[PDB]
Amino acid sequence: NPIGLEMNVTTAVCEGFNIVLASFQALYLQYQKHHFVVEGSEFYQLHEFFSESYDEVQGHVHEIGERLNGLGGVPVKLAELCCFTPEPDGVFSCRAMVEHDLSAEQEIIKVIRRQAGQAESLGDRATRHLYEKILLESEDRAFHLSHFLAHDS
Amino acid sequence: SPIQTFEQMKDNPIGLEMNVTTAVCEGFNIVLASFQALYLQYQKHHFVVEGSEFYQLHEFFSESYDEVQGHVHEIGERLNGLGGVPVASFSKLAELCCFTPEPDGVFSCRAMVEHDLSAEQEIIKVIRRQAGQAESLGDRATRHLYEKILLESEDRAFHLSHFLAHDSLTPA
Amino acid sequence: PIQTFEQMKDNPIGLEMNVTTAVCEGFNIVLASFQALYLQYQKHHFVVEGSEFYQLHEFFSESYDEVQGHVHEIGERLNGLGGVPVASFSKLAELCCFTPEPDGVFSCRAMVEHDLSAEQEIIKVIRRQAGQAESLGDRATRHLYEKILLESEDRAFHLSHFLAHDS
Amino acid sequence: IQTFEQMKDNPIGLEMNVTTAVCEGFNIVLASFQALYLQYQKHHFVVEGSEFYQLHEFFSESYDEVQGHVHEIGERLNGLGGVPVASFSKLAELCCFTPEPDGVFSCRAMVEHDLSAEQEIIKVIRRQAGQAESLGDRATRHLYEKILLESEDRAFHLSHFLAHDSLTPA
Amino acid sequence: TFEQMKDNPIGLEMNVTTAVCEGFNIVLASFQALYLQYQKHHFVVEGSEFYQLHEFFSESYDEVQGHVHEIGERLNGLGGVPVASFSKLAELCCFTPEPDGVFSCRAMVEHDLSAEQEIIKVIRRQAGQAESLGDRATRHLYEKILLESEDRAFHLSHFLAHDSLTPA
Amino acid sequence: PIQTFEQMKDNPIGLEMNVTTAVCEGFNIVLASFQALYLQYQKHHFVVEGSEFYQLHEFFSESYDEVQGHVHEIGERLNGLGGVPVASFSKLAELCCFTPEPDGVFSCRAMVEHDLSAEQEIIKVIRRQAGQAESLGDRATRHLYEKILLESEDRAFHLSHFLAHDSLTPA
Amino acid sequence: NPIGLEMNVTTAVCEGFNIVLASFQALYLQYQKHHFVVEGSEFYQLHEFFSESYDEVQGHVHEIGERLNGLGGVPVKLAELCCFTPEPDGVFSCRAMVEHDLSAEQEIIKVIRRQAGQAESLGDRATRHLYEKILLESEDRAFHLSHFLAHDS
Amino acid sequence: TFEQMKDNPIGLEMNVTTAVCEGFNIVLASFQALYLQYQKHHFVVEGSEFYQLHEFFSESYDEVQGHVHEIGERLNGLGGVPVASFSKLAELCCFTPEPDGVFSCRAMVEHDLSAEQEIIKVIRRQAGQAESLGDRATRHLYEKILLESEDRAFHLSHFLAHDSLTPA
Amino acid sequence: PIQTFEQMKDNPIGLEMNVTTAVCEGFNIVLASFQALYLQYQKHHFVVEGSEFYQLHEFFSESYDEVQGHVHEIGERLNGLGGVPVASFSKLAELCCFTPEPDGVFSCRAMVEHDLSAEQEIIKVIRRQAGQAESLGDRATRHLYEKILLESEDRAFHLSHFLAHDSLTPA
Amino acid sequence: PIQTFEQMKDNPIGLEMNVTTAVCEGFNIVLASFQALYLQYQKHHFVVEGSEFYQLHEFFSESYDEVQGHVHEIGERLNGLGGVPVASFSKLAELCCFTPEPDGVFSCRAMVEHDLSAEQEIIKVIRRQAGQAESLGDRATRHLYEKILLESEDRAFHLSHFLAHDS
Amino acid sequence: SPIQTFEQMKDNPIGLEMNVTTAVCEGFNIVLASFQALYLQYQKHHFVVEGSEFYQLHEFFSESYDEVQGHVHEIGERLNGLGGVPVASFSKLAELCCFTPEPDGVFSCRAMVEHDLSAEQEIIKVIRRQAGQAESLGDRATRHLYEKILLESEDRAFHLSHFLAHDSLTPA
Amino acid sequence: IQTFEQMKDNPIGLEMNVTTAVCEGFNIVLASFQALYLQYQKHHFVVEGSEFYQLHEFFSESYDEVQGHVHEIGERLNGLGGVPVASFSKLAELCCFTPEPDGVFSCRAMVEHDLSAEQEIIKVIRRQAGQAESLGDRATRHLYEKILLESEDRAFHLSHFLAHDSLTPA
Ligand SMILES: [Fe+3]
Ligand SMILES: [Fe+3]
Ligand SMILES: [Fe+3]
Ligand SMILES: [Fe+3]
Ligand SMILES: [Fe+3]
Ligand SMILES: [Fe+3]
Ligand SMILES: [Fe+3]
Ligand SMILES: [Fe+3]
Ligand SMILES: [Fe+3]
Ligand SMILES: [Fe+3]
Ligand SMILES: [Fe+3]
Ligand SMILES: [Fe+3]
Ligand SMILES: [Fe+3]
Ligand SMILES: [Fe+3]
Ligand SMILES: [Fe+3]
Ligand SMILES: [Fe+3]
Ligand SMILES: [Fe+3]
Ligand SMILES: [Fe+3]
Ligand SMILES: [Fe+3]
Ligand SMILES: [Fe+3]
Ligand SMILES: [Fe+3]
Ligand SMILES: [Fe+3]
Ligand SMILES: [Fe+3]
Ligand SMILES: [Fe+3]
Ligand SMILES: [Zn+2]
Ligand SMILES: [Zn+2]
Ligand SMILES: [Zn+2]
Ligand SMILES: [Zn+2]
Ligand SMILES: [Zn+2]
Ligand SMILES: [Zn+2]
Ligand SMILES: [Zn+2]
Ligand SMILES: [Zn+2]
Ligand SMILES: [Zn+2]
Ligand SMILES: [Zn+2]
Ligand SMILES: [Zn+2]
Ligand SMILES: [Zn+2]
Ligand SMILES: [Zn+2]
Ligand SMILES: [Zn+2]
Ligand SMILES: [Zn+2]
Ligand SMILES: [Zn+2]
Ligand SMILES: [Zn+2]
Ligand SMILES: [Zn+2]
Ligand SMILES: [Zn+2]
Ligand SMILES: [Zn+2]
Ligand SMILES: [Zn+2]
Ligand SMILES: [Zn+2]
């Protein structure tokens, strides 16, 4: 390790980095599928939102991956280590599309929080910090999805 | 310690006289107050709208509060230029408001579109009367600025009325 | 009147006059169709309203800009080949591929369907004229036709999504 | 729903007494500007000769300017509650000037034709802007004066295109 | 309505969302007052150095509006309601806004500095609260706003320093 | 000279020379005033110094290019309306509405005051010419005149703001 | 189908669209992993190249996907329908990284060519055309990889 | 070396790569000659309409250089060697370049038009060849270059038309 | 006037007033010539018309803003070197190196030729002042003078190119 | 000399003078270190050559620009808190975290290793000063420290890849 | 039909005389020819380089052929301005070339870097002698343009020499 | 490999007779400009007062200008085959002027200090540019004249910053 962190903590943080990376990759490809297949009266809204969300989540991926390899691990079984349940096959309701996306982001929020706690416990600040950086934007995306799901028109 | 208290103006560096800069200045203050209230309302709507069309309303409300903030900015800069004092207190900003601001709380998307629409209309009438005043009194620049603010705020009210039409790709 | 809308003139790229005449009256057919579709999209941008009025406002406007691009392409290529593009209202109306929507405000539903029908009737002539231009050996024209066709098909796709029964 | 004769209410506080007049003036102006847009586009397409590049680019820039004019006037027109003209029947009926017949004409000829169209659209615009002022609608009078400014500029540039001067000696 | 909270899509309990959303509302109200004041100062500033203060006040009220918008979006997302009317924005504002009327540029800079200081205190404390209840993203947003607010205070103090090219 | 100065020719937009003569005379005098104002603002961008040297450096530059943009608008429209714009040194000298600053460097305050006075008398000339153009039915001239008026009134605002007896220093 | 193509050909082209989409997705994620994990003396070169290549290949993906859903199918088993062999786990030689990438792009080139032939046979031009559009750039990427693999310095 | 071919990373046989790479070399040589000529014309053009031809010649030689670079990169990728020296670039060029010296603008436009026409013929034919041997990407690149070359010829012919604002 | 024209003051870069006086005189005359050239190019952007109206429209505009950029460089450097730049109408009139075009619209060819002659005599003045600045050891003045020379020589090239007896028409 | 490099002055944000003094001499330590590292990266950009000389030319240059950003941040924050930043060569040299590379051209290998060692010695002080500033309640300073630290760690990562044994 | 044959000039619209514009013009033609050859060589190198560092050489060669093309452009525009005729034939472009162009074929990366380097050097000496000539004869602008072309081409040769140094992170 | 005394060969065709001299002049100029960059940066950091914003932004823009100067001169210096100065020992030894001592000084004082530094760096630049001309190296003489132009401009602007004039009356 080339930053002075003990092996102890680098393994433990790369562990969670691969969990969140697999989950974020699943989220990215599912948002991509949604961007592809949405139709209906509000489709355009969703058409853009999904495209703005996957372009967002992959960002997460890359820097996790870039810093994951940085700490001495190997970035990602993408099916094994993913924290949430991926979308089944076929095109669903647009409403269930955003419901699935909602819950996926919620569970990745949770594991990101736990990993930030672990990184803080053992004295590696930057990882905790970056987890917080992603956490704010993913919470924001959850806000916007639930706004999509509100019973109003 | 104030050097130019609210209801006390001075001179203007343009060559106008105070038979009409005073009139145009407190005609400006009304529109400034109501436009500030409308900007705050559009910002709250940007914040809290939800539902089927919520993305459309989100972005439209941000666009519109930026437009009205630009109106506020130029009205205030010109008002200070001609010798007036702009309103800033919540007290007077609530007093001089030409329309009734929306009460606090989340409304249905339709309800806030209606509130916004008639707020716009009631500011449009103030603006037209003040443009007529500025024309009668020989102040060209104020009437002309009023007229272009008028044009694009009428455009804003057009788009607002368009969101309220009873039509859609849905069966409703 | 130096040249009129039936006299065909030579081309500076080395094509024979038969393929010139054929490809160019096809050009003018689908250009008149594209201009009619452009103006339909434009006034639809003007008159659309309702719950989803922002989405369609944007979509209509982008569509009439892209069809304007198509029209400039076909017109420049058409004169370059030695023809003369259509511009009169009467001729334009006549050679339009589809029946334009009658003036007056229609429902947003009906407007979307009018646009999608106009685009499919234009896609028909584009496919056909592409087959033609390929048979006559006009490769650059065929290539142009293919581009215009693909993005017209994509517009048909986004119309198809606008009219789906969901939410 | 609404056809090209019946009018809808306006959400701005203007009376249909004024709306009807300003929107029919608007429709005349829109038909005129659409005819000029098509003419300038054809001119960009078919122009050729020694000064071909100048006229190519000038024709294209002015057709996009008049295009902008039609979007502006059309969106305002709909705002008042009227219905804009679109099909070729009523665009030919309601057009201010006589459009150029089909076929590629001389450089001189179609520059002059554009001057003709611009001049008489200017006539309509100015006097119906006076009308708009009389009706108490300031916003459309202002919009009219901006459009009149830009079209008078276009007429100036065409006017200079057809001046009797050149670097080619007399 | 006001004085009410709905649910949450990120998994925080209402014990934490109510408490942090009240502080968002307070900070948003004071930031809106500071935005209006910075705008008034950009309008009415004049004198020897008036262009400096012109540009600084404009920059500052746009930064403050950015803070306001981020806090408002996050506040509604957390299930609260942002304040918008003048009555509660005057009530809940942590500092006393400048009374109406034109003040001299120096007094304007002093008012802005002390307003920034009080809002900094409120921000620090609500950030501490947010940290104790386990809301880390709120905490992070508060700290970003706090850093840039502290720099705004730095620049105001620099404007207030007793030094010049003039022998004053 | 194929078209002599004071010889106005036909316009291609349908105005009559009774209005074009007057509005081109007005255009030429405000053009001369603005061409002198451009050079004075530019001279101030050159020679200004002092404790507030930076602010007025950039203010004078921005004002001189605003004034010279006014110049292009007025000149292009004027020649569009048959007339000929002023370009001769003596001509502008003649037709300057204000007195240009005498030569040499002055105190920055005196320079701001000179610029303000030049602005203000151009204000008066512009308003009188706008009234003229309105009465004679030339709407576009009056409209351009109006936004020239708006931005130059803003410039005069900023100048007098420079002139206020206030500062972070004692005064 | 909303463009006038018979069901006959739409099914047949969506078939190959999912093959090439799964292959391109595997290629994209593998180029991403390479962008993550490359080290050595020339790493920077590869560091950027991989990032410029995956951003490229995903482009392919999206428009395939956007037009796939367009023809009436459902876009993507990503492991099942992929035409080439994905990378095994761990960080390999940088040379074998680009060798694996080389062969992956070669085989997707081949199936793209066959799908273009099929689309041409049955009269749908735009698909054949788009396959050609992607084919040129993927051939170019193969050129650049083999250039990376040349025995010279 | 010249007159040699190596392997291929995209799976075409040398029966097709040799044959299409020879035509790439021919088209690249003629395009380099046309680029040099358009540049010389941009340099030496003068007269009544000289600014039009100035800008057109510059635009045209940059378009032709784009064609040259795309063909060269694809040619090396296919396993061939691009031509670069003056001897073989003068040999393999399909048209006769303009002799040295300044010509009148009209003769320059005529030379450029006929050069574009001959290169169009060569391009069409090598595109047909490429199609028959199953090289589709080469075919597509050739057709793009052909479309924009045909438009260059269109604009040259427009410059050569007998019409003007002058009564000439 | 706190600093009178023809009264040069101390420079903060270490030159002696023997060289600054001469180079500021030269700067002022080339500044006056370029300030007249800017106005003449601008007048040509205004009043030009004909069959080649478009080309010279944009050429005259680009040339006048190039010339006025020369003006800013020269003026800022001049006041940096103690002197004061010319701004008075009569002053520029005096110190114009060429004869400005008489008033009224001329044929476009005559206007191009007037601009070319103005350019050429500014060429001569610039070269003489560059030799002066070099002999007296002022390298930066001479260097700026040299690129002014380069771009104005390019402008003269383009003007004479306009003047060639050649076209797609018969001549 | 109004204020000198030991007199500390009040802060306008409401912090107590103890945390001011502590956080600000930490600021000056790591700012002097950052400036030394910046100049080392700059002359390495100057003097690097070899087979991979383009990669390193670019990397060195981007690194000395990013460290310049760090230095501006720390200096502005440091004066704002009430301290005075270091600028003299003697003081800068003394308070530099690491031993700067001695003048003269070194191998690209050795230069990369010198830079990576300087960055690790600076990361040490950044981590430590972040812990400090957090203990004293200076939250904005701690946040700044965290940003600077993370991207310094990323630079250490790209150095680590430059020195790997591959190809 | 040529109106100004290669070795036949005319007048220059600047006020120079033909004792030195002729000299500077065919001094310009040499550098134009060699710079055109170098641009073609750099383009071929952009095309055909491969190997360990091939990305670096790829982009560097494109950068450098753009730089030398800019040199060619300004030399040619100024040459036509002062009354000369620019070289364009392959015949004369090969004749007047100051250095020997690389023979056709793919070389090792090192070999083409060496060819490029010494081509640059041999053009640098031509450029310096021509700058001295232009200075002696009183043509300032040509010498100054020569000097800035000189500066950035010396920079190009610096970077070239840097690629050739016997150093690297590899054990070689 | 190469230390700060021995010189390497240049690939441009200049002789070490010239290279040694121009590179030691270069190193003097580089040390001077690095000292001025650090000074301008400190000035941007610690400036305050009534005109604080002016000097803030001016100091920062000029420190980036002198920064550009050091990149330019350093890359050319290495090009000749010399070795650039970097550590604080030789930057303090070889610097043209006396750097400002530590601590925040008056506005007047450090504007004047910057004027001092600029003036004497101008001295060095001009006479050693004359030297560069005598040696037959035209490119570095040209580069020197551009840097001299920009630094004389900076000296002008500082000079005007300290003029005895203000809108605050006397
Ligand atoms: Fe690693
Ligand atoms: Fe799992
Ligand atoms: Fe005021
Ligand atoms: Fe009220
Ligand atoms: Fe034709
Ligand atoms: Fe029909
Ligand atoms: Fe309507
Ligand atoms: Fe009619
Ligand atoms: Fe909510
Ligand atoms: Fe309160
Ligand atoms: Fe005229
Ligand atoms: Fe007078
Ligand atoms: Fe579908
Ligand atoms: Fe498989
Ligand atoms: Fe190869
Ligand atoms: Fe041949
Ligand atoms: Fe001075
Ligand atoms: Fe004279
Ligand atoms: Fe301080
Ligand atoms: Fe130390
Ligand atoms: Fe010539
Ligand atoms: Fe030779
Ligand atoms: Fe070296
Ligand atoms: Fe020393
Ligand atoms: Zn990366
Ligand atoms: Zn949002
Ligand atoms: Zn403002
Ligand atoms: Zn709209
Ligand atoms: Zn076109
Ligand atoms: Zn889409
Ligand atoms: Zn064209
Ligand atoms: Zn619109
Ligand atoms: Zn938002
Ligand atoms: Zn103009
Ligand atoms: Zn014009
Ligand atoms: Zn998409
Ligand atoms: Zn490449
Ligand atoms: Zn390339
Ligand atoms: Zn300046
Ligand atoms: Zn300046
Ligand atoms: Zn470099
Ligand atoms: Zn700063
Ligand atoms: Zn990286
Ligand atoms: Zn050129
Ligand atoms: Zn700052
Ligand atoms: Zn560099």
Numbering used by the authors:
A (entry chain F), G (entry chain F): 17 to 92, 97 to 173
B (entry chain C), K (entry chain C): 6 to 177
C (entry chain E), J (entry chain E): 7 to 173
D (entry chain D), L (entry chain D): 8 to 177
E (entry chain B), H (entry chain B): 10 to 177
F (entry chain A), I (entry chain A): 7 to 177
Mind quoting what the paper says about this structure?
X‐ray crystallographic analysis revealed that TlDps1 possessed His‐type ferroxidase centers within the cavity and unique metal‐binding sites located on the surface of the protein.
